[PDB]
Amino acid sequence: IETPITANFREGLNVLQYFISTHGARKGLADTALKTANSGYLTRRLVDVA
C-alpha cells in the first residue's frame, strides 16, 4: 500500500491505521490455512519419489 503505518503500538493506532493493518494481517493468516496444503503436498511427492 502507498500509505504505510506511521504510528506504533504503544502510542495506539487510530481507526484507519487499524483498518489498514487488517488487510495484510488477514492475507497472512489465510496464507497459513491455505498454502500449507500445497507445501505439504510437495513434501508428499518428494517422499514418494525418494
Partner 1 sequence: MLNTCYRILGLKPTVIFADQIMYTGFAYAARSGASVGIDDMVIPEKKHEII
Partner 2 sequence: YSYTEKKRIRKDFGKRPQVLDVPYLLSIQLDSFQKFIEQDPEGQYGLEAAFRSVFPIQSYSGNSELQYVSYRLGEPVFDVQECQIRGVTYSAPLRVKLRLVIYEREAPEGTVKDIKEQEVYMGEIPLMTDNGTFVINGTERVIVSQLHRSPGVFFDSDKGKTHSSGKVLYNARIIPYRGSWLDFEFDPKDNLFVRIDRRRKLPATIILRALNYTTEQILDLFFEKVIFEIRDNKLQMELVPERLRGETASFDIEANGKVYVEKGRRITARHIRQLEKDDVKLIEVPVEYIAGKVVAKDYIDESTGELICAANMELSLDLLAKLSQSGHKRIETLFTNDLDHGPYISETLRVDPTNDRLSALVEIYRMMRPGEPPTREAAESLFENLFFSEDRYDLSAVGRMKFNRSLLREEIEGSGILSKDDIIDVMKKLIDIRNGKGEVDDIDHLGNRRIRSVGEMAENQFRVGLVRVERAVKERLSLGDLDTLMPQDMINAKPISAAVKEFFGSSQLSQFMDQNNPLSEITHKRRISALGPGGLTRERAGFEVRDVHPTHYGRVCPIETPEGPNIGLINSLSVYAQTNEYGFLETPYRKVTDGVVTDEIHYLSAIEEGNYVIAQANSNLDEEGHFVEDLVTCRSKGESSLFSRDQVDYMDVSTQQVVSVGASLIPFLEHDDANRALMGANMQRQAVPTLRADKPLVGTGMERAVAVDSGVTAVAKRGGVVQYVDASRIVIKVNEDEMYPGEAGIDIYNLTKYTRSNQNTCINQMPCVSLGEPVERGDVLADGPSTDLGELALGQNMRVAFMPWNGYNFEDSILVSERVVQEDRFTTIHIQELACVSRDTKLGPEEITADIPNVGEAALSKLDESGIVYIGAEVTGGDILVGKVTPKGETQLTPEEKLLRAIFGEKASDVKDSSLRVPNGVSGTVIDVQVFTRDGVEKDKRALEIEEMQLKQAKKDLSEELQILEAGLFSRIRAVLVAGGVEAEKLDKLPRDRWLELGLTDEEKQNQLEQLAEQYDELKHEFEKKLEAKRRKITQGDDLAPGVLKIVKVYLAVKRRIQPGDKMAGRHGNKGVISKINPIEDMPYDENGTPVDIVLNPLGVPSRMNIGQILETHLGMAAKGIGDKINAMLKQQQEVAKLREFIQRAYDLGADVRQKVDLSTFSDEEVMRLAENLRKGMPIATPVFDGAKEAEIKELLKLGDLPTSGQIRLYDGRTGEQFERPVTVGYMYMLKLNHLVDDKMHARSTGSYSLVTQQPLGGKAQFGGQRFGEMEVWALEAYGAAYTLQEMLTVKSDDVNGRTKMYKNIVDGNHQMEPGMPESFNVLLKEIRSLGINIELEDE
Partner 3 sequence: GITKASLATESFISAASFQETTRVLTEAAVAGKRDELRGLKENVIVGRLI
Partner DNA sequence: CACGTATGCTATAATGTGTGCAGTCTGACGCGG
Partner DNA sequence: CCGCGTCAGACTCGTAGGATTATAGCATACGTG
Partner RNA sequence: GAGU
Interface positions with partner 3 (CB under 8 A): 45-46, 48-49
Span from 9-17, 19-27, 29-37, 42-50 in contact with RNA (CB under 7 A): 29-37
Q: What is the DSSP letter of 3?
A: S
Extract the runs of DSSP E, i.e. beta strands, from 1-50: none
Contact 20, 1 (CB under 8 A): yes
Q: Which residues contact 3 (CB under 8 A, 6 or more apart)?
A: 20
Closer to partner 2 by CB, 23 or 42: give it.
23
Site of interaction with partner 2 (CB under 8 A): 3, 9-10, 12-16, 18-19, 21-23, 25-30, 32-34, 44, 47
